[PDB]
Design a protein around this nucleic acid. Structure first.
Ligand code: MG
Ligand code: MG
Ligand code: MG
Ligand code: MG
Lengths: 176, 177
DNA sequence: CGGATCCG
DNA sequence: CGGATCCG
């Protein structure tokens, strides 16, 4: 995939928001715009992007085997590089140029943890996770864990998660 | 994605590749020798249909690992790179108007028997062997035999010698399970 | 830092 | 079973 400007990425996401769907045992099921979250360097508002990252919120665990492996994009030329239930990397054609589109899935209960993970940047996550690891925790895209057991946090949004974990809330573009 | 191949098709592809593999080392084209190219995977196990072609490249110096697969060259053959690093490089190659997957792996000379053992498989066989060794506080991989994170210096050269030294019955590749 | 998908 | 490359 070629590199994109921030505005090019935003235009691609805008286009994709009404055109994502998946095939579920022969039935085309549309993915709702409210369940599509821009993540990665695009959410961090970086001037150039290596690719476009979208997080898809899947409402039922049983649908994970169907969503990314049978992903459909109305009107758009694409091919699949690698694809499973949780990550699907596509090469898309946008105005005669090839760009990389990375799709990820989260369940509703994972959403704040997934948004936190997929926003990055990697350096920031490593720091946060190292600090939590010193206190016998493990943070990932699915939850907060201690002794391989989910720590049930009373939170909904990414902001609530970050503050509950004991860190300073920063907007995506100021996380470093 | 790559299409499936017959055993003969795989063998023909390997035969062709044996004289045509090289790599670029700081602007210098260095040919890979046929003696340092080993057919591995399902091709070595003589399976009737193959999902891809697996080659193990024996690299004579540790310093070359950063150069070999990341600057791989194949004379005359159309290919593209899917994923690539120092130890694994997956290519899609064009062979008689069809696309196939070619998987290249690297081993150092001292790793050769271990690498051949690993890359021959099948997976079920390796899991069984490794589970048994794990019970005795060993760890076997493509690079060596280890105990307490330390290389167990075995006095062996070939894959057959390794298998017997590990305490297992030697079987030819096609009879491993 | 931690996991996904892939490699035998 | 154990590791590589790539994902944030
Ligand atoms: Mg990205
Ligand atoms: Mg991406
Ligand atoms: Mg193979
Ligand atoms: Mg292979």
């Amino acid at each position: 995939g070629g590199m994109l400007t921030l505005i090019q990425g935003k235009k691609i996401v805008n286009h994709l928001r009404s055109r994502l769907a998946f095939e579920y045992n022969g039935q085309l099921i549309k993915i709702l715009s409210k369940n599509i979250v821009a993540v990665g360097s695009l959410r961090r508002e970086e001037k150039m992007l290596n690719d476009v990252d979208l997080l898809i919120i899947v409402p039922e665990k049983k649908l994970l085997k169907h969503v990314l492996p049978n992903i459909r994009i109305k009107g758009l030329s694409f091919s699949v590089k690698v694809c499973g239930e949780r990550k699907c990397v596509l090469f898309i054609e946008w105005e005669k140029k090839t760009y990389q589109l990375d799709l990820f899935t989260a369940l509703a209960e994972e959403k704040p943890y997934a948004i936190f993970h997929f926003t990055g940047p990697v350096s920031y996550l490593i720091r946060i996770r190292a600090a939590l690891k010193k206190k016998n925790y493990k943070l990932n895209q699915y939850g907060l864990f201690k002794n391989q057991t989910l720590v049930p946090l009373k939170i909904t949004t990414e902001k609530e998660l970050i503050k509950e974990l004991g860190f300073t809330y920063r907007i995506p573009k100021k996380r470093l």
